[PDB]
Design a protein around this ligand. Structure first.
Ligand SMILES: Nc1ncnc2c1ncn2[C@@H]1O[C@H](COP(=O)(O)OP(=O)(O)O)[C@@H](O)[C@H]1O
Lengths: 382, 374
């Protein structure tokens, strides 16, 4: 496939100066890792029969991803060394000032891979926003070609729009790391803390955006602006906000992301200002299963769910495309997903800890796990 | 299927010698299990038979299981059986910091009485959050906020439940956590009135304590009900991210202030109907308020014989407290809101504008029966 990217996280103790010098060894790693890899699914180690274990001394985690393939697809390759980016995440943490995030940070790193959708939504947003960023970096005339530098995600509260914005900025900061030396993200109104004072109205919306502006005045640095619960905000201040929004988007090295927890009453002013408006719905039956399966598999990783009676093949597998014979356990779990139609994405993430409390035993058997999960679902719906 | 055991040991005896006699403890707990109450303490004195040497070591033992009801009267793991040693004097103010398990919190869990099996549900759920956290479950796959909000009227002993919960967790997670510490903020509603800069400071000290991975950190914020609030919520997040911490919150409002915290909470549990002991607390609080005002004045009866706090459910009770508890039983149906409005009706019945303690009891009792009817 023509354009595929690779993100590689090195150690802090690994000197960045030597990276370009040992760049050849990284490319060998990527060739070996691609022999068995899933799209956008991170590999943390090169195991036996997959290549020299000395390749493990190079990286902490690598991701190989493309927008040409489905979100989970396995590869079957030609990767230009310009699309492979090496990075180290900052652990500095969020700062009070409206929270400032240093990108890429430790907190955002595992978001993207764990976001589950059935509509190829992740690929669509990723590729489109990358195009907006790529164009903007190349200083496109806004008059000739219309680039708003704003993106809007809408849907119910449980769909994880914020997580999309976090993870999206995480990837873009790495993707564009050759173009930008430093990358920051400013998050506003998380959650609805800003809105009440904003409803009361104040002058400091200007003051807040003026600081973003200074950070935007800094070139070779891209800034991300996330705005949560937009309609909780949007009244003298909403004009200042929109005016301040307009000032910010004019910069080439800036990108603003909005999320609206309300559906079907979108503010006309924001839709008009958006490059793209994406609706994120509550997960479908296939997506619900995927989340439930991921929860169980994670519960098994930490040793919460252990069962030696049933083997890996018999364990619930990926149910994608109905291309494999659905195991009864795979089927029973799917039946649970059918019972969990009302539950949101966040609610499904909440389910495991409720299941854990119900279980008497310190460790849950797989057959009982299915039974407990079903009970929690029913209890959560009531 | 799931049973734990906790054992308090005298400050004298070392921790190794107890480990040597550990096997004897297992055989002892099984024997003590035969005749026992769930989640109720068994004293060393209770059984003189067996070893005086083994009984010299421990002060009391508590056997608890979440599958059984609270007081029911009816299978051992060395890990499931824990061994704790009380911190004699750990309350220091700055907000307060507690070293767990402490002596003060040690007897409160057994004195909490709910009609709704509330203790077991909360115990089980918070334990699940504690275990999941300790195993470092990925947040992005399985969402664990490690923040818990408990809501109910001022008489239902919410903050005590949090204290007793953190006490038992430090003992249950004894093997995983070497040290356990709890910070209690805003008890009660004191920090907002104070004018801050201190909230950033005290939370920074928690961060320092929470830096130790072996340490277990509890943060209890009670009476939760613009710049100071944001700063408080931000600090909550930085702690919330840590794997070794747990945030316990109590609110007097059932549902008025939801947006900020409810979303952050793993679970929001309501206490439910007030128990007999809860309604007693609300009735006593009203009478003392009427006394402070000057509505209820009695110079014949001394302060010792006035209604007192029932800290121990089986301790001796004064004649007046025994009466007020009876009246609290009389009002089984009334909600917390109804009981808090009774004093107005009580004062209405009194012709004297000034009320003695015996007449205060009679008028409260009448007011209770009239509001039940109507
Ligand atoms: N599609 C999904 N896949 C995996 N987890 C999800 C999904 N949707 C929601 N979640 C979980 O629910 C939470 C919702 O996060 P957030 O982005 O704040 O939701 P929203 O932006 O819709 O309010 C996330 O932390 C995530 O763990």
């Amino acid at each position: 496939l023509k354009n595929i990217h690779a993100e590689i996280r090195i150690c802090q103790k690994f000197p960045k100066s030597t990276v370009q010098k040992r760049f050849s060894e990284f490319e060998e790693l990527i060739k070996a890792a691609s022999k068995n890899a899933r799209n956008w699914k991170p590999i943390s180690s090169v195991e036996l029969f997959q290549g020299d274990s000395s390749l493990n001394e190079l990286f902490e985690k690598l991701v190989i991803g493309t927008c040409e393939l489905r979100d989970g697809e396995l590869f079957e390759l030609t990767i230009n060394p310009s699309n492979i980016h090496v990075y180290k995440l900052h652990k500095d943490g969020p700062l009070s000032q409206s929270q400032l995030w240093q990108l890429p940070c430790v907190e955002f790193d595992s978001i993207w891979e764990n976001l589950i959708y059935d509509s190829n939504l992740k690929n669509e947003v990723m590729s489109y926003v990358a195009a907006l960023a790529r164009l903007s970096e190349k200083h496109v005339n806004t008059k000739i070609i219309n680039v708003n530098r704003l993106i809007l995600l809408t849907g119910p509260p449980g769909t994880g729009k914020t997580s999309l914005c976090k993870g999206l900025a995480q990837h873009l900061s790495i993707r564009m790391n050759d173009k930008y030396s430093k990358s920051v993200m400013l998050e506003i109104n998380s959650h609805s803390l800003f809105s009440k004072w904003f409803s009361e109205s104040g002058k400091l919306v200007q003051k807040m955006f003026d600081q973003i502006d200074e950070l935007a005045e800094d070139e070779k640095c891209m800034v991300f602006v996330l705005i949560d619960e937009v309609e909780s905000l949007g009244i003298r201040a909403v004009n200042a906000l929109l005016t301040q929004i307009d000032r910010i988007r004019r910069r080439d090295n800036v990108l603003i992301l909005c999320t609206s927890n309300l559906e079907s009453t979108l503010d006309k002013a924001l839709v008009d200002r958006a490059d793209i408006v994406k609706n994120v719905g509550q997960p479908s039956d296939f997506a619900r299963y995927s989340m439930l399966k991921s929860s169980i598999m994670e519960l098994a990783r930490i040793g919460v769910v252990i069962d030696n009676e049933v083997h890996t093949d018999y364990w619930p597998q990926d149910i994608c495309d109905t291309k494999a014979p659905r195991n009864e356990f795979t089927e029973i779990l799917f039946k649970i997903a059918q019972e969990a139609r009302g539950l949101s994405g966040r609610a499904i993430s909440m389910l495991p800890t409720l299941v854990y409390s119900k279980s008497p035993e310190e460790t849950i058997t797989l057959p009982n796990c299915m039974n407990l999960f079903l009970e929690a679902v029913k209890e959560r719906l009531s």
